[PDB]
Amino acid sequence: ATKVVCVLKGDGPVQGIINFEQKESNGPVKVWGSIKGLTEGLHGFHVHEFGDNTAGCTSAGPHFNPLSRKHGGPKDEERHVGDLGNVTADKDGVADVSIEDSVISLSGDHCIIGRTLVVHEKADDLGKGGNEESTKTGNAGSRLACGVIGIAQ
Amino acid sequence: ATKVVCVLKGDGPVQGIINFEQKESNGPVKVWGSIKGLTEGLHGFHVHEFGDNTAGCTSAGPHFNPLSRKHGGPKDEERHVGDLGNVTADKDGVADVSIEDSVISLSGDHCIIGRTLVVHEKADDLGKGGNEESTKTGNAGSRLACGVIGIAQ
Numbered sequence A, B: 001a002t003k004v005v006c007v008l009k010g011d012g013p014v015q016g017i018i019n020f021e022q023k024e025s026n027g028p029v030k031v032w033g034s035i036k037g038l039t040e041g042l043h044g045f046h047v048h049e050f051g052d053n054t055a056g057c058t059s060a061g062p063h064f065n066p067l068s069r070k071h072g073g074p075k076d077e078e079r080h081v082g083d084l085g086n087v088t089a090d091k092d093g094v095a096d097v098s099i100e101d102s103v104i105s106l107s108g109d110h111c112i113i114g115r116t117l118v119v120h121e122k123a124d125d126l127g128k129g130g131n132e133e134s135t136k137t138g139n140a141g142s143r144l145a146c147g148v149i150g151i152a153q
């Protein structure tokens, strides 16, 4: 029923297209698409609070966290609304994204429309790493590509 | 309150930053910022329906028109919600944008968040141009630059 889309671009080679679809109110959201130009392995994959790309991906601010929780993985109760874990790039540098999530929404206060989707330099340790930054950012490092999340036809 | 923002980019040299602010729910929206790389004169300036940049600015679809009206100027009863008229570039190719509008909103309904702002090749005739296209697009021609309208801090 509701479809939303994000074009990921950055200052380097990373680029992608991510689609979101929600068949019903407060239903699960299907997330799918492709990202290229990545180093092989895990890359943190988050909805950030601001749809502000004025000075590139840094303008997007922290993880989208309307419920003031700590950082976690998508399968954790203790998570930011924006915590979609990691996407995994193969040896060609391509991540084929296929996620279903029950916490993000395309309506209401969990809505991600008008926020920024970010793919990160490093793996998200899903809040299980050895330090304080783990339960804020997951230690996923710099922002390789981002886009504002928009309404699709 | 509410603040939202749009980074305009395209297939060419036009680029801009547009800020929106609404102090009160369903109150007027102040629009301000700057666009560079333009030809001297009028350039149509519209909110388009979809926040979809998948294949560039064409993916944004038609003017944002939730009430199914004909194309007009921002001061007309008879307008699309997305009809913000023209920005004017100086001989230096810079439009300093300064608009106040009571039809677009950042809340309630008529909300432009997650839609696309587009600056056009030609002047918008505000529906007064004397052909059929005037009452749909205002004959403002191709899409020089666009961006998805996002939530700001």
Ligand SMILES: *[Se]c1ccccc1C(=O)NCc1ccc(OC)cc1
Binding pocket: A002, A003, A106, A107, A108, A111, A112, A113, A114, A151, A152, B111, B113, B114
């Ligand atoms: Se959801 C959300 C989040 C932030 C700002 C606005 C909205 C919203 O609900 N906008 C209305 C809307 C959303 C999606 C679609 O897609 C068919 C249409 C209208």
Ligand SMILES: COc1ccc(CNC(=O)c2ccccc2[SeH])cc1
Binding pocket: A107, A108, A111, B002, B106, B107, B108, B109, B110, B111, B113, B151
């Ligand atoms: C921080 O800015 C925000 C402004 C508005 C909202 C919530 N708005 C909506 O879901 C909505 C739904 C239907 C029609 C119009 C709108 Se604006 C969230 C954040």
Ligand SMILES: [Zn+2]
Binding pocket: A044, A046, A048, A063, A118, A120, A140
């Ligand atoms: Zn992040």
Ligand SMILES: [Zn+2]
Binding pocket: A046, A063, A070, A071, A072, A079, A080, A082, A083, A136, A137, A138
């Ligand atoms: Zn987080």
Ligand SMILES: [Zn+2]
Binding pocket: B044, B045, B046, B048, B063, B118, B120, B140
């Ligand atoms: Zn237009």
Ligand SMILES: [Zn+2]
Binding pocket: B046, B063, B070, B071, B072, B079, B080, B082, B083, B136, B137
């Ligand atoms: Zn129009």
